[PDB]
Design a protein around this ligand. Structure first.
Ligand SMILES: CC(=O)N[C@@H]1[C@@H](O)[C@H](O)[C@@H](CO)O[C@H]1O
Ligand SMILES: CC(=O)N[C@@H]1[C@@H](O)[C@H](O)[C@@H](CO)O[C@H]1O
Ligand SMILES: CC(=O)N[C@@H]1[C@@H](O)[C@H](O)[C@@H](CO)O[C@H]1O
Ligand SMILES: CC(=O)N[C@@H]1[C@@H](O)[C@H](O)[C@@H](CO)O[C@H]1O
Ligand SMILES: CC(=O)N[C@@H]1[C@@H](O)[C@H](O)[C@@H](CO)O[C@H]1O
Ligand SMILES: *[C@@H]1O[C@H](CO)[C@@H](O)[C@H](O)[C@H]1NC(C)=O
Ligand SMILES: *[C@@H]1O[C@H](CO)[C@@H](O)[C@H](O)[C@H]1NC(C)=O
Ligand SMILES: *[C@@H]1O[C@H](CO)[C@@H](O)[C@H](O)[C@H]1NC(C)=O
Ligand SMILES: *[C@@H]1O[C@H](CO)[C@@H](O)[C@H](O)[C@H]1NC(C)=O
Lengths: 348, 348, 348
């Protein structure tokens, strides 16, 4: 017998004051379209120019927000002439061979001088070619290493603009429920005298007069409130000798000695009769349970970043460049000939 | 005494026509799961292959959407022989030294020819090595400079798909409120005869019959509407000699000469009595104010992009490459020897 | 005459059991603020350090979530001496010219040896310079080609965190409607005895007692339910000789032989009278239609990726590097002089 037969002090309205309410309801959201350049980048021209390659995403966000003795002296004469004549013929061999040698040395040394001037003109081409191609690699790699950090910050400002767009769509879907509230609250109270307490102005309703506002309706409700209420002990029902008895359109207001079915909203007692009450059987309480569970979504739970990264990274290190190490490739006769050019006159 | 005692013409229902309403309510959203490749990239294979490195984000979005004288002639003979014998010994010195010199020149010139063929084989290695390593740097840098612009456009299409997912979750959270409206509107009108005007069909309610639809309920409401209404002047209350008097379940319909408490929803006058009215004291109006402020969120306001960028940029420019400038490193005797090889026979 | 005059079996309440309901309503959401590092990257330090360059986007998401014979022998003596004296003067020319030649060969060969040691010291500089500058280009390009795949996965985890933030704002905008439901459901039932069936506990309302819970209100409703109901055939209205007749606060309960206006919620018949019914004219049914179309947004439809890419791509291929092709730049007299240095003694 838990609570259905407990008696507790309940306030029941004892007189009235006449009153009026001004109640303001908004009935209509202006389309807060966003320029996506000025939001994300603003004045800063390098990121602005990057925004064009993010495509027409800005428009896409605005679709959302815009909606919503003579013999031996003579034989010595034969002898010395035969020694001389044979010597000079050996001088001509000695000298002709030296000319044929020194003329092959002067050939090959000038062919070497030609080869080195060929090498210098070709290597001037290589250090000139590498000057231009490697200056361009340097100048363009400096541009590309300036440009992946600005995209990083644009992409984190994209999320700030997507939080802007979400909170601006969220509010517009509350506004469209407040326009449904303005529809039911217009209908039931401008087209319809209510018997509900505090709907259509504080207290109890007499009459109303709507007036417009720029995006709203305002109601003048004429109503009466309780100027003066008393706590009567009560029960919702009473179980006499195993039968439960309970009101019809009232409560059991409790007098010191008797039960009366007062109207819930006023102290005006009337006697228990089979026309003021209903009746039951066996004196039992039915117990009901209601639990208004408002949706808890499937939130997007993820692996640790190491697992979702390692699924698809290559730690490729290019080798230390080694190339060819070219450091590993490593007068007396003219004095005499000048001396004997003089000292041969001592044998003239 | 603002509005509670003003009298204005109010329409009060004068006859009825019987009527029926067909009212359609949707009570149930099909799970619009999205393939994230086909949405963002479509057929285009280079961006498709990039999508795999964005991780399983697609699934994460689908968790959401799937939820929700003889002596001097002889001394001259001694003399000339002594001059000749001494001269030839000086010829052998002159010639042996020239051979030892010209044999050191032919040694060193062929050691130079060896060194230059060593240099050409090592430099053929360097321009062949740099050919391959620098072609790869060129060929791969062209690939990497093709691949940061396609990620830009994928990342702006991600926001278009996140606006898709947000508007598809927003609608599903309206659908779940329309399924709560279908619960109260089923209960109060299929299980319960309403005393409300225009709830359960135009006019006043008699009876109803629900019928299903594929994702909805449809009600046949049987109701009566006012076929024919008259404007009576009225007041919500009247203050006689400093006491306010007001109805009980009606309005003061105003006849040319008397006040009657008509029922709000019909013209049927009844006389003012203490059983048709309540009464007050001192003739004052209570004024109430209600302002139904619907949530305005903390929207994500940001610095200018220059401040949020400059927090974390280095304008490093690599110097213009300069390297070594190798352009800054800059027969008559054989004719005679051929001539005296002939002209020495003139002294044979 | 479609449905307004059809008669069908309707259940009308025949006794009561007293009952109590416990009804639980949540009235208040704890601020689930998110550390954005631990959500997206977690422990993994390389992506963590990247998060700083995405800016204070994390804060921006937390603004949202924290809200919400002697002569001829002598003439031969003159002759041979004149031949010898003239020959030696031609030897001095032959030898002085050879010295002046061989001294220009020994000059130019050592000037060549100087030029090649100059070349090797300058080229040691070039292969040393290119060693350092090209090792840095290799070492830094390896760093930059490691650093665009981790940003890809951060940017797809950003969308997972933006789905988290959207579903956490969506739920908080349902919570703020459930706090409006707790306001009306507190007011009409703690401050006000309802005449509605199943609002304020199963059945019909007597009385109630609210009790708090940590984020909720719980109502004890005392109510009566129907312990025991009978199907009477009925019509909502009847059209006698071309006039439609219909109840006032009841239904036409159908007895075997007569029509009675029973109260909708109880079987208790009363006779048709002009005080139990309203009356009409011409016997016609008005037909009304109501179609409660719940917002279907402008969803962000996009071109194919090829069109939105091609608006802003350059397929620049750098040419195959060609450079200078240096492979296209391509003892007997000392034996004799050693032989005649010996064989000239045969003419001493
Ligand atoms: C074969 C040859 O010439 N080797 C030389 C060596 O004599 C010299 O001492 C050194 C100094 O750098 O350079 C190398
Ligand atoms: C405050 C006021 O002017 N009330 C008027 C009253 O003067 C008038 O005699 C009556 C006639 O319908 O209507 C009401
Ligand atoms: C236009 C019209 O039909 N008005 C009728 C009237 O004729 C009828 O006398 C009255 C009550 O029966 O109800 C109303
Ligand atoms: C020391 C030397 O040989 N200098 C030469 C110069 O004589 C010549 O006129 C010039 C032409 O390129 O090249 C250099
Ligand atoms: C002009 C000259 O020296 N040409 C040579 C050729 O004689 C040799 O057969 C070839 C072998 O690589 O190299 C080149
Ligand atoms: C209800 O109140 C009356 C007096 O007001 C008292 O006599 C009675 O015992 C109370 N009911 C219960 C169950 O105590
Ligand atoms: C309450 O109303 C009654 C009924 O007329 C009246 O007699 C009584 O004086 C009123 N109370 C006050 C405080 O005015
Ligand atoms: C309504 O029911 C009665 C008997 O209950 C029957 O005589 C009458 O014909 C029914 N109405 C119609 C239109 O059939
Ligand atoms: C229903 O109520 C009546 C009225 O007192 C009673 O006579 C009847 O026995 C009750 N029915 C049951 C099954 O108790």
């Amino acid at each position: 017998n838990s609570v259905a037969y407990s008696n507790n002090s309940i306030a029941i309205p004892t007189n009235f004051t006449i009153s009026v309410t001004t109640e303001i309801l908004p009935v209509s959201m202006t389309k807060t379209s966003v320029d996506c350049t000025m939001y994300i980048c603003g004045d800063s021209t390098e990121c602005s120019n990057l925004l064009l390659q993010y495509g027409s995403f800005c428009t896409q966000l605005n679709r959302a927000l815009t909606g919503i003795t003579q013999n031996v002296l003579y034989e010595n004469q034969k002898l010395i002439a035969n020694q001389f004549n044979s010597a000079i013929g050996k001088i001509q061999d000695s000298l002709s061979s030296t000319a044929s040698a020194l003329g092959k040395l002067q050939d090959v040394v000038n062919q070497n001088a030609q080869a080195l001037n060929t090498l210098v003109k070709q290597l001037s081409s290589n250090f000139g070619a590498i000057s231009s191609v490697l200056n361009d690699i340097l100048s363009r790699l400096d541009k590309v290493e300036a440009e992946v950090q600005i995209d990083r910050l644009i992409t984190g400002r994209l999320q700030s603009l997507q939080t802007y767009v979400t909170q601006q769509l969220i509010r517009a879907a509350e506004i469209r429920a407040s326009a449904n509230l303005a529809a039911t609250k217009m209908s039931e109270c401008v087209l319809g005298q209510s018997k509900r307490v505090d709907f259509c102005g504080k207290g109890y309703h007499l009459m109303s007069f709507p007036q417009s506002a720029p995006h709203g309706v305002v109601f003048l409700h004429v109503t009466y409130v309780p100027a003066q209420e008393k706590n009567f002990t009560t029960a919702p029902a009473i179980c006499h000798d195993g039968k439960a008895h309970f009101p019809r359109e009232g409560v059991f207001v409790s007098n010191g000695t008797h039960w009366f079915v007062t109207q819930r909203n006023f102290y005006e007692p009337q006697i228990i009769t089979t026309d003021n009450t209903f009746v039951s059987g066996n004196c039992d309480v039915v117990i009901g349970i209601v639990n208004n569970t408002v949706y808890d979504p499937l939130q997007p739970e993820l692996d640790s970043f190491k697992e979702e990264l390692d699924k698809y990274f290559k730690n490729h290190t290019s080798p230390d460049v080694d190339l060819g190490d070219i450091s590993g490739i490593n007068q007396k006769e003219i004095d005499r000939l000048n001396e004997v050019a003089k000292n041969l006159n001592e044998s003239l």
